Design an enzyme around this catalytic site. Structure first.
Site, PDB file in Angstrom:
ATOM      1  N   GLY A  14      23.225  67.965  51.031  1.00 13.66           N
ATOM      2  CA  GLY A  14      23.073  66.770  50.224  1.00 13.66           C
ATOM      3  C   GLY A  14      21.837  66.821  49.349  1.00 13.66           C
ATOM      4  N   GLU A  15      21.999  66.436  48.090  1.00 10.26           N
ATOM      5  CA  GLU A  15      20.921  66.539  47.118  1.00 10.26           C
ATOM      6  C   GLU A  15      19.890  65.433  47.305  1.00 10.26           C
ATOM      7  OE1 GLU A  15      23.188  66.426  43.538  1.00 10.26           O
ATOM      8  OE2 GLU A  15      23.645  68.568  43.541  1.00 10.26           O
ATOM      9  N   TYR A  16      20.285  64.368  47.992  1.00 13.93           N
ATOM     10  CA  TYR A  16      19.377  63.255  48.241  1.00 13.93           C
ATOM     11  C   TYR A  16      19.374  62.871  49.717  1.00 13.93           C
ATOM     12  CZ  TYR A  16      19.461  62.994  43.172  1.00 13.93           C
ATOM     13  OH  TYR A  16      19.368  63.293  41.830  1.00 13.93           O
ATOM     14  N   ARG A  81      20.422  74.268  44.379  1.00 15.08           N
ATOM     15  CA  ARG A  81      21.569  73.814  45.146  1.00 15.08           C
ATOM     16  C   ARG A  81      21.808  74.759  46.317  1.00 15.08           C
ATOM     17  NH1 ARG A  81      26.715  72.413  41.695  1.00 15.08           N
ATOM     18  NH2 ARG A  81      26.158  74.267  40.461  1.00 15.08           N
ATOM     19  N   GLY A 123       5.349  68.766  42.903  1.00 21.39           N
ATOM     20  CA  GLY A 123       6.646  69.141  43.434  1.00 21.39           C
ATOM     21  C   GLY A 123       6.638  70.519  44.062  1.00 21.39           C
ATOM     22  N   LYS A 127       3.615  71.243  39.170  1.00 20.08           N
ATOM     23  CA  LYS A 127       3.078  69.896  39.018  1.00 20.08           C
ATOM     24  C   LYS A 127       3.136  69.416  37.570  1.00 20.08           C
ATOM     25  CE  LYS A 127      -1.634  71.870  39.038  1.00 20.08           C
ATOM     26  NZ  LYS A 127      -1.319  73.229  39.566  1.00 20.08           N
ATOM     27  N   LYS A 143       3.851  70.213  32.131  1.00 16.76           N
ATOM     28  CA  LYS A 143       4.567  70.675  33.310  1.00 16.76           C
ATOM     29  C   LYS A 143       4.169  72.094  33.659  1.00 16.76           C
ATOM     30  CE  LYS A 143       8.928  68.252  33.968  1.00 16.76           C
ATOM     31  NZ  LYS A 143      10.391  68.470  34.100  1.00 16.76           N
ATOM     32  N   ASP A 222      18.748  60.710  36.164  1.00 19.24           N
ATOM     33  CA  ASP A 222      17.611  60.018  36.766  1.00 19.24           C
ATOM     34  C   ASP A 222      17.192  58.771  35.994  1.00 19.24           C
ATOM     35  OD1 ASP A 222      17.510  61.767  38.848  1.00 19.24           O
ATOM     36  OD2 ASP A 222      15.481  62.507  38.448  1.00 19.24           O
ATOM     37  N   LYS A 224      16.087  55.466  35.422  1.00 20.21           N
ATOM     38  CA  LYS A 224      15.526  54.340  36.148  1.00 20.21           C
ATOM     39  C   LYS A 224      14.372  53.755  35.348  1.00 20.21           C
ATOM     40  CE  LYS A 224      13.091  57.730  38.967  1.00 20.21           C
ATOM     41  NZ  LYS A 224      12.745  58.114  40.360  1.00 20.21           N
ATOM     42  N   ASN A 227      11.198  55.813  34.585  1.00 29.66           N
ATOM     43  CA  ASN A 227      11.345  56.897  33.624  1.00 29.66           C
ATOM     44  C   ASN A 227      11.482  56.393  32.197  1.00 29.66           C
ATOM     45  OD1 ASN A 227      11.153  58.879  35.555  1.00 29.66           O
ATOM     46  ND2 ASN A 227      13.363  59.217  35.729  1.00 29.66           N
TER      47      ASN A 227
END
Ligand SMILES: *CCC(=O)Nc1cccc(C(=O)NC2CCN(Cc3ccc(-c4nc5cc[nH]c(=O)c5cc4-c4ccccc4)cc3)CC2)c1
Length: 389
Positions: A14-16, A81, A123, A127, A143, A222, A224, A227
């Site tokens: 699962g990705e989340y 993945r 991450g 970063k 990034k 993403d 939201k 963002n």
């Protein structure tokens, strides 16, 4: 020419919700690697989200034996993945097939020029960093990715990739950083937006989503409130500051927060362009109602809230807004507004966006309902400490 090279049942993590789920995966010669909850009897335009083009394959025995990982650099974000089969032989059959197709598709700026201001996020593979170019005084988000695991296109409502450079061990993406302030900060400060104001922000997001879907053939996925930023003029800038982050362990492990996640994404089912329309629904719901659609602490509840609890609307909200949010927030992508072959056009033609010239939106003809308190793009007002209040 589009044909299925290899298909079969896999165990995708699962990705989340990082649990293993049985998914029937289709590998195609165009490079699409899509997984489904059930074997599909069977948009048609290929989404690059599932593309195995320019991806490195890794065979692992951790965390589970017979695991193979597909790592891809999509735009400026490294995605992974993780899959699992029963026997090593099966894994080799899959990796050979994928690698074959990945090859079948194959047919001075430095770090010293910037000033480190703030750590925006961290991450697995790098970063994100808020920088100020010494020469221009402009503000950017850099990034910094690990080179080991690894410009021509632009849109007015997307954070532009200014330039890309690499060091011996690090790859760097310098992106435009809007200085009109975080949109959640504006929504938090003003509690609720008028329908007119939300229409403005909504219209600009639609334009950018149409671009990413029809031109780039990609799902943003993403969308939201966090963002979304405003520029100095008060126009929307959808950000690209995301990073691959490992999940956190009540005893289960979750990747991020689910409140904005489309139901089909939570279940790790097949997803498409309809995902962003859900994301748009959530965002626009919060702007006009002053709160998130579903909210509960227990994630077991929050998942159910998104998965089965149907959305209700304030009585002070206009029917035109109701129809928009109702359609945008349909749990089934095929019934969801914008989930059809028309995609964004299905939304642009909605009653809520009547009278809105969509060529005017793209050309920023629309006068912003709100103008941020900045002198210029170098005004550091919304980075200051009073940003707290
Ligand atoms: C390590 C954990 C992990 O990988 N989890 C995981 C698993 C499976 C999938 C994902 C995943 O999709 N994660 C992120 C990927 C980045 N997404 C945001 C985003 C989408 C699209 C763009 C973008 N792409 C472009 C492609 C080609 N040309 C362009 O011009 C593009 C422009 C953009 C862009 C969009 C908005 C603003 C600026 C640029 C960028 C980011 C979120 C989900 C993760």
């Amino acid at each position: 020419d589009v044909a299925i090279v290899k298909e079969g049942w896999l165990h995708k993590r699962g990705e989340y919700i990082k649990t293993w789920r049985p998914r029937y995966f289709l590998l195609k010669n165009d490079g699409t690697f899509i997984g489904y909850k059930e074997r599909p009897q069977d948009r048609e335009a290929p989404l690059n989200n599932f593309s195995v083009a320019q991806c490195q394959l890794m065979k692992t025995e951790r965390p589970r034996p017979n695991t193979f990982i597909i790592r891809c650099l999509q735009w400026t974000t490294v995605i992974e993945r993780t899959f699992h089969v029963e026997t090593p032989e099966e894994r080799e059959e899959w990796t050979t097939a994928i690698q074959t197709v990945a090859d079948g598709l194959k047919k001075r700026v430095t770090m010293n020029e910037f000033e480190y201001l703030k750590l925006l996020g961290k991450g697995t593979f790098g970063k994100v960093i808020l920088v100020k170019e010494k020469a221009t005084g402009r503000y950017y988000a850099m990034k910094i990715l690990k080179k080991e695991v690894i410009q021509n296109s632009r849109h007015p409502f997307l954070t532009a990739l200014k330039y890309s450079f690499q060091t011996h061990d690090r790859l760097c993406f310098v992106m435009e950083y809007a200085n009109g302030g975080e949109l959640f900060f504006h929504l938090s400060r003003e509690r609720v937006f008028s329908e007119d104001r939300a229409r403005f922000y909504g219209a600009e997001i639609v334009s950018a989503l149409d671009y990413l879907h029809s031109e780039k053939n990609v799902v943003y996925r993403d969308l939201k409130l966090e963002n979304l930023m405003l520029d100095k003029d008060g126009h929307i800038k959808i950000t690209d500051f995301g990073l691959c982050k490992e999940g956190i362990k009540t005893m289960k492990t979750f990747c991020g927060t689910p409140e904005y996640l489309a139901p089909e994404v939570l279940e790790d089912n097949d997803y498409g362009r309809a995902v962003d329309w859900w994301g748009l629904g959530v965002v626009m719901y919060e702007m006009m109602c002053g709160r998130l659609p579903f909210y509960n602490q227990d994630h077991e509840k929050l998942f159910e809230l998104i998965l089965m609890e149907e959305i209700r609307f304030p009585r002070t909200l206009g029917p035109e807004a109701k129809s928009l949010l109702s359609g945008l927030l349909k749990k089934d992508p095929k019934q969801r507004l914008g989930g059809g072959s028309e995609d964004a056009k299905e939304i642009m033609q909605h009653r809520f966006f009547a009278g809105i010239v969509w060529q005017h939106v793209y050309e920023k003809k629309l006068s912003p309902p709100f103008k941020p308190q900045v002198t210029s793009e170098t005004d550091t007002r919304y980075f200051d400490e009073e940003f707290t209040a």
